[PDB]
Nucleic acid binder design. Sequence first.
RNA 1: UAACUUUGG
Lengths: 621, 621, 622
Amino acid sequence: GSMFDIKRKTIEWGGKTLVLETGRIARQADGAVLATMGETVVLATAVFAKSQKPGQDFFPLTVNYQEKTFAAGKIPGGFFKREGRPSEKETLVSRLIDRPIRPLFVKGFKNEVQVVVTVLQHDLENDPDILGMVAASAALCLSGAPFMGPIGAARVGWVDGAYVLNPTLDEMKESKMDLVVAGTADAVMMVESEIQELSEEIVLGGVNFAHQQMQAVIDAIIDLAEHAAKEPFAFEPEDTDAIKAKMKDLVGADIAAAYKIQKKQDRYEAVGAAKKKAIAALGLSDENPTGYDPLKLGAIFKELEADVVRRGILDTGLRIDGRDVKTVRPILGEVGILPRTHGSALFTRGETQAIVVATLGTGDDEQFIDALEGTYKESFLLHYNFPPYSVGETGRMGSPGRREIGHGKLAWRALRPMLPTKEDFPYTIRLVSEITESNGSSSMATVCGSSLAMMDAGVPLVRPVSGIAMGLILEQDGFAVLSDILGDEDHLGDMDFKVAGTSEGLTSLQMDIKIAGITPAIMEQALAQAKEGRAHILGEMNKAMDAPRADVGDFAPKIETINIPTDKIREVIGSGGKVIREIVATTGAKVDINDDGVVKVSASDGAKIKAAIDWIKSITD
Amino acid sequence: GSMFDIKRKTIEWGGKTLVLETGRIARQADGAVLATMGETVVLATAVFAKSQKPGQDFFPLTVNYQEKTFAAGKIPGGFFKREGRPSEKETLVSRLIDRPIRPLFVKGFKNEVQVVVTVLQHDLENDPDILGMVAASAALCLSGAPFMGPIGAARVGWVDGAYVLNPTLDEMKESKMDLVVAGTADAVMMVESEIQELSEEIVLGGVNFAHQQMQAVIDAIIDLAEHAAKEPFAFEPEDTDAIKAKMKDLVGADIAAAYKIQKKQDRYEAVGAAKKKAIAALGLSDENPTGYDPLKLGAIFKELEADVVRRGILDTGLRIDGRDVKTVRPILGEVGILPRTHGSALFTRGETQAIVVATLGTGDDEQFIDALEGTYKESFLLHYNFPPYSVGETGRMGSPGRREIGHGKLAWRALRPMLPTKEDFPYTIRLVSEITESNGSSSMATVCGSSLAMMDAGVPLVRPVSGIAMGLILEQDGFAVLSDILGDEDHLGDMDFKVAGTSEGLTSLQMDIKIAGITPAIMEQALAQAKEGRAHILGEMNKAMDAPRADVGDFAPKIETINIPTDKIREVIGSGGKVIREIVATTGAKVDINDDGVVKVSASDGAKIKAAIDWIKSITD
Amino acid sequence: GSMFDIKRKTIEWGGKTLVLETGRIARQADGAVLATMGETVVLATAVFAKSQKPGQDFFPLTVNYQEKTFAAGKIPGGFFKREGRPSEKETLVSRLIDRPIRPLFVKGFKNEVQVVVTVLQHDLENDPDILGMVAASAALCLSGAPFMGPIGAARVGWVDGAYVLNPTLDEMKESKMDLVVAGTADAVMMVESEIQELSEEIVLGGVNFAHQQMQAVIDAIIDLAEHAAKEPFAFEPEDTDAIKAKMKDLVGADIAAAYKIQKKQDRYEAVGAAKKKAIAALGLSDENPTGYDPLKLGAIFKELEADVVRRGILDTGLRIDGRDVKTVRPILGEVGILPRTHGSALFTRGETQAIVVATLGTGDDEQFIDALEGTYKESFLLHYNFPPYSVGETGRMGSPGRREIGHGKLAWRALRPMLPTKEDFPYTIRLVSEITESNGSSSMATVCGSSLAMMDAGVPLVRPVSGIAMGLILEQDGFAVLSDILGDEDHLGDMDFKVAGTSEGLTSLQMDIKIAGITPAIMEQALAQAKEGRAHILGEMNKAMDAPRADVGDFAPKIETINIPTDKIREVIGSGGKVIREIVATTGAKVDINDDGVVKVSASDGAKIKAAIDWIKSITDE
RNA sequence: UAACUUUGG
């Protein structure tokens, strides 16, 4: 009877029951939502500074998704029994939330914003990640911060050749696609996916499927905001078009005219030149003449640079390097570069390069993951490393940051679906990708190098995988779609996207979108051009390799697998374990019988393994 | 190296020999003492900067208590076999030392000071912590730093109805009270305790007991200082009384009436008016020399503000939030808020709020603590989290800092004495308390939330526990004692204290005191008012619950126990685990046989446990 | 993208094949070399900032040596299964590379430079560390940074009375000396070693041996640089001799007296009377423009500082603290200061002081080290701690930094060779050395205190070990060799070196050298003076102790050991530990079963151990 | 009818 919520218990969303509550908990945050999606509960908070730090210069947004093991009725596994540094899940999901909302803050807003999402209860069916996205969105636009429309989110699956909305953990066991999507009422904003070799049509279909489905939730949020959101924080942007045109009136040609040596990316040299030029004589202090903030001109400059380029590409047709929109950079794959490593590749495309090395392991090498939804054992590990020398800079080394965890994850999603099944190949695989040069999708370079490194390693990959990173320039009067984008091209795009798959379908599509009006018709085309690119890349790729090696490396351990009758396990293990010990001692192979009668035999020889297997079969057949 | 110590191998203190030595070791620190309390030996160092960092702002004191595992003839258990990040003990004891000395530095002093205490040898009887406090004190007032009088410290126990001074680890096994106290010769400064349901009389009796007992040691220190301390470091403020007087006239009346008022949130016009007004009339500008630095004048304002607020309270009797000295804020406890969690509560008191979740576990969930004195297994874990959203702010999230470890520990002390025995309740208990709003003791809110959440979880707590945080205004002509203080109020109080306990006695008393003059007779009253308060709050509390649930939640493992013949264990485990795991997989119950024949079966259904038990017995006959 | 390497697949070097490749990998670094020494492969990069950060102050060089577990076909064993924090090897090898190159950058250069060395493949024979250093050197002087290399490196072994170049890990098993050495064509720059009690003669011999054998690699690099290096980055030094004479005329008196001071530390004198004094005289302003930069005089000031101080020693063999070049500071060792700790010592020499504590443990206490080349179990642990109060400062506490890891390692190398064999003494040893005061080699103080602390602990050390830190002034005419250098004396030396050994030979020699000109005749003498010093110090040391205790501390533990058939290990562990834990529960002894069937049983009583042993034997016999 | 127990990064 104290406190005053205010709930939108409403919505049955995908036939699952979603509650949005505010005004009971954390009433001191700017906005705070306790969201429930039938039995899974998360708390999301938004707080924002009511003023700017002296010379900010960039928008300082922070998102913390965090899981508490009590949400699953467990105590942490660590030696400390307390949750600590974020897990892979926590890192990824934070990014998942960050990505769509970041570019939805009103132009020029650069006050501290922080979103904490804490998962409080996990029902073992509805993943708290999507719920987490929704609750964050809700909290934000309840806070009164200048944050444009609410967003919604959804996960799309593909079972029985049909789209399924927010598939439960169990339903996902059945699905040929894990697609997460976030966007507003107007624009779809973020896509992250893992796909079982499905068609562009299928995938893009699921993108629109989500975009419709999630509207229910966006409406629900807008409803709760109208009963309960705060007074908007007064901050309207600044018509910069005024001063911006009066900058074009000077450094228009002065920039255009010459980036653009190029090399030694300086480029930077002429660039800073132009910057400083407009800076003084543009407008500032004492006084005499003017006027117009000295710091705020910096941002107006980068916007103009950005602009200038785009138009250059829109109107014939050629990009900063001398190349076409459709042109992929020269490519060279090269396998077995580190002959004693289980598998190795060098993949180079233009000025992006990755050394990738496969390593084969046994059961003792697979990774324990203390998931909220119950602990699992991960046998495919991919680690992505982005050292500063790759871009010709110096910088702090040591322990992956978010970006590296993300890119790793992307490449991981790309490759996983092509891995052979346990039965066929009972090894754990760890790929490490070392980005040694970078100028536009090192992550794609990662997937391609991995495809090769695995083949070198002798992994019966069902089909090899390629990746390309794309951009899209969109003006009111027309649009360009860019293939294999440069570093300098990353920010010009209204939308950046990365596609990887096989010669028969997509396996991962990721999309980041900055502005509304990227119409399903444009997206169709974007993908089709990428189809052509990854196809070409694959072409160039498998002239290095083209199919998996017959065998694992001479340094790789040998694991082979065999099935025996369940009622026979007692005779092979023997009276505790008299027989099997003798087999393991004598043949010198590890023999794991577990329990369905699936025996996996390992050793350094092929012979030791066959010696063992022969022994067992004489007892069984 | 020929040496000149200077030793005070002195005092039977509490019947143990205490040695204070200087001049032999660490001669380059400003002060360095090798303290020994009959066989336990620590080295304490004090060093301080001889000048201030440019715009300091706050007094930068650091205390590092650290244990070296060789002190107990052990090698660290880590993978690294080197001692590393501080333990719980290490963090707590540093705070314990920090707390009393921090406010004893001369007003205005803001140079770096660091105290290192290193435990060198542990005799498995006399705890290094107390000795550590002593040693620190000694080193400081030997250093020449502007540190006022020495402090002493003591632990008081309570065995067989009598006060025990510095009880040894064995003595403490019999004691119904762990009370640690620190102070100067004039005042008690710091109290931290864990208490088995003892009366305010007995507790406070123990505080005076310590206060007198420690004088022997303060004496000892004073003595060593005169044989061996350094030249005092020349420093002195800065009298603010003067410039305060020129401002007490200017805005006095202003802020004064500018208070009652009321509502506008913290009175506004005359408030900020007075602020910038007094700023203007003074503070350089300069325009006129003299004076200010509107950092130094800003500080003098805070002091002035406080002074009138306090005066406001002494003369009727009404507080910032317009409540009586004795009035506790509205309170609402709420159980089972996350119904799948083993036990949950939301406790809300005014603008302080904690979500508390109990989680029940077994033996693999209890925490290893390798104390110097012997490694033990902790089965009651309390983790306190203080996210910045609680107070409307943004901040770095991740890895609990000292204050959170402290507060957790406080709440832990408060609850532990009411825990059921292993026999009655064979579970590991982990409470985590998430502070979602904060305006005055979140730690006390944590105790109350915990007491409820445990009851929700079905833990046969012997009695429920409540906590209140109090304050004290002290002027020459009178005093006010405040109940359930606001945040704002912790600043102006001359003494802050936190009391928690049951309907029948105290379970934790913590005190922090900034000034002398805090009479035994005043403390008696202070506690008695708190007695009334925590009683009130308990009243409010248990209208939400009042007694433990008879049973543990449907999601908590139920644990049942049965015996089997030792000569049969092999039949139950079966060939390679084949049987046992079949039973665990099918019945869904975990089965723990170990070894004398004790089988303990657990699961969330009683149906699974009984199914398992039936299965087991058919094999056992 | 098409490549243009440029490889120097050349050199048979010590009968291994060394390849240096550039132009295929990491073409965006300033310099990038993939080096292979027959089947071991590393990638080294060098990058340098083309401009200086605002008011830099110091030359900001960073070296990252890192190993990737795939280089040996293995997956990291962490709970994360990813390489993380650097390992000891990783930390030390970074230092190893850092040390020789740092003082080879052209005077006054203070732009960011970073060297990353990543081990990509390890052939289980040729260590990547030497290769690492070579590759670094190569990458650097391909980058076109102002770096006065190239440098080479080598490791020298001593098997069957002859120097062995770049011994393989198997060859090292037989060697009585692990000596790694780096230098330019003109000077040896860096020496780090662990030595089995070998003569100064033989050790110095190995130093020259390396210096000659490494020329091959230097030349190889110079060759690849001429086919492939970049355009040198224009940065000309600055004739500082110009200003520097003027300042001698001002503060050259003001400095001499302040040193003649002591100990302030402080030194308020130097503070003021250098400082703004010389700056008032010379230095940009507001008031006076023309000329010198307030920053760059700082550097010139330090160099004048050194110059005065040095000169004082050549003119009057008398040093800051009033002592002779050969004079070691007063020394006092003290054992059993922490009588319950297994062994303890206080070592004080002048104003450097270490508390050192030995601790005995069993097999559960030895440290797992998963080297690329094969995971092993380390049973001798030495941890060195250098807390800021030792020098009168305040500072972050916690997790040892590179320097502490290094100094620990140094002391470790110094003592290890005199450890008893496992047979005689089957314990884990952990030494912890707490540096409680410091004014010149705390590391050496560490080895001395350790020698004592282990003796106190009862460890049958074959011979005790001492160490001394030395310096060298080398001028246009003559040279001084300084014994037991002060902190202040570390900076001025053209060469710093630390020597430790027994009364019968050297155990560890470390050298860091700033300039050429150091004839083998100078080193011979330098070492011989140090011989006298460490001899002297040992003398003063075993006034405190003299020989190991007959027995281990009363607070134990004791270990007795027994052999059992391998096919019986199963019956002593029992079904799921059923037997062994019951044995450890009841007898109260730790039970350590190896593989050969070598069981070591340990506890605080002999009675507990015998109970355990009897129990196991009852299971074992007939 | 228990395969040889100890799993801190």
